[PDB]
């Protein structure tokens, strides 16, 4: 990829380093916060100390009329709750009004990601990606987004999102671009004291990446063996999740009654949360919460991986129960129950966790229930029993809605968890 900068967490020295081979120095401010689950994820808040400065290896400093180059990174931007029309920088490689930079903005309910080039005569070119907050379920709001920006000095700058080309702008009218010796990762000019971003995997490439390269990069950095929650973070054990069923996003999961004679079902309406002319979204913190419990994961840590065997705890009136069924019950759709954990006995309760990767909304999960001999009982979804859509496990080779997302409470979403 002609990679000339690759910011990566290194376990041995417990530190962010440049692993490109060029050994650019990475200085971290005391205001930077790290995810304890994934040390590549760093949080930059609106504080002077919340910054990362890269001192570029002399050989990778950009000063050229013709050198093609690209950059990639992942970013997670909290919902905007207030207007600003206050464009603020987040990644800066500028000196004397020339170079490149990434900035963010929020206007007319659109969150914007902005790429700017500026030549040594002060002339600017920009390419923008934007997405609306006026939408029931967003692939983008407060979710990890993969950004790739490529620059061909003889033609266009292009912005790719999650491996897909979104926008292009001609940049052939720019002359010499003399960028900074340093790259500054920092909220610069942001007037909201409480704004922040999450970022990871920042890369620079000494070429214009092509379509295939970018899709491969996206796929390789997706960590596709690990399940994701709604926000795109690693799915985890022992963490309460609200459940989104993608079949009918306007409904939510509820428990009619606990016990092996009870059932769960699809209840509506989910409803919406609104701040007029700022956002209008489906309410996410609705319905029964699931907690994923370790059973047979080979691993030590709390991350849920493809084909992990787990138990699912179901929270009802602030008490935990176990998702289970008697597969011997009549019919191909096995109605699921929330049963008292000490009393689950010989009921089927082992769930195989699966990723679902297609070209629709990201971070989809499936759950395949098995009996205690490993035999498939079926994927967890719904079946219409006259008037009621009940939660069931059903073998597809023997009913609907077996695609799920797990939603934990997150400060960037802004529904109150009170």
Residue numbers in the entry: 863 to 1260, 1269 to 1288
Lines quoted from the article behind this entry:
BoNTs specifically target neuromuscular junctions (NMJ), where the toxins are internalized into neuronal cells, cleave the soluble N-ethylmaleimide sensitive factor attachment protein receptors (SNAREs) complex, inhibit the release of neurotransmitter acetylcholine, and eventually paralyze the affected muscles. Structurally, BoNT consists of an N-terminal light chain (LC, ~50 kDa) that is a metalloprotease and a C-terminal heavy chain (HC, ~100 kDa). The latter could be further divided into two domains: the N-terminal portion (~50 kDa) is the translocation domain (HN) required for the LC to be released into the cytosol; the C-terminal part (HC) is the receptor-binding domain responsible for the highly specific binding and endocytosis of BoNT into motoneurons. Amino acid (AA) sequence alignments based on genome sequences of strain IBCA10-7060 showed that the HC of this toxin is most similar to that of BoNT/A1 (~84% identity), while its LC and HN share ~81% and ~64% identity to that of BoNT/F5, respectively.
We then determined the crystal structure of HCHA at 1.8 Å resolution. After large-scale crystallization screens, HCHA was successfully crystallized at 1 mg/mL, an unusually low protein concentration for protein crystallization in general. Dramatically different solubility in solution was observed between HCHA and HCA1, which was largely caused by variation of a single residue (HCA1-R1156 and HCHA-M1148). In BoNT/A8, this loop is longer than that in other subtypes because of a unique arginine insertion that makes BoNT/A8 the longest BoNT/A subtype. The third notable difference is that a 3/10-helix (residues S955-S957) linking β8 and β9 in HCA1 is unstructured in HCHA due to the deletion of two residues in this region. In HCHA this loop (residues E1218-K1226) swings ~45 degrees towards the center of the HCC subdomain compared to that of HCA1. The alignment also suggests that a surface-exposed loop in the GBS neighborhood on BoNT/HA (residues I1263-A1266) is highly similar to BoNT/A8 (residues V1272-A1275), but differs from BoNT/A1 (residues I1271-S1274) (blue arrows). This region of HCHA is likely flexible because the electron densities from residues R1261-R1268 were missing in our structure. For example, an arginine on HCA1 (R1156) that contributes a crucial cation-π interaction with SV2C-F563 is replaced by a methionine (M1148) on HCHA. Furthermore, while HCA1-R1294 forms three hydrogen bonds with C520, T521, and D539 of SV2C through its long, well-extended side-chain, these hydrogen bondings are likely missing on HCHA because HCA1-R1294 is replaced by a serine (HCHA-S1286).
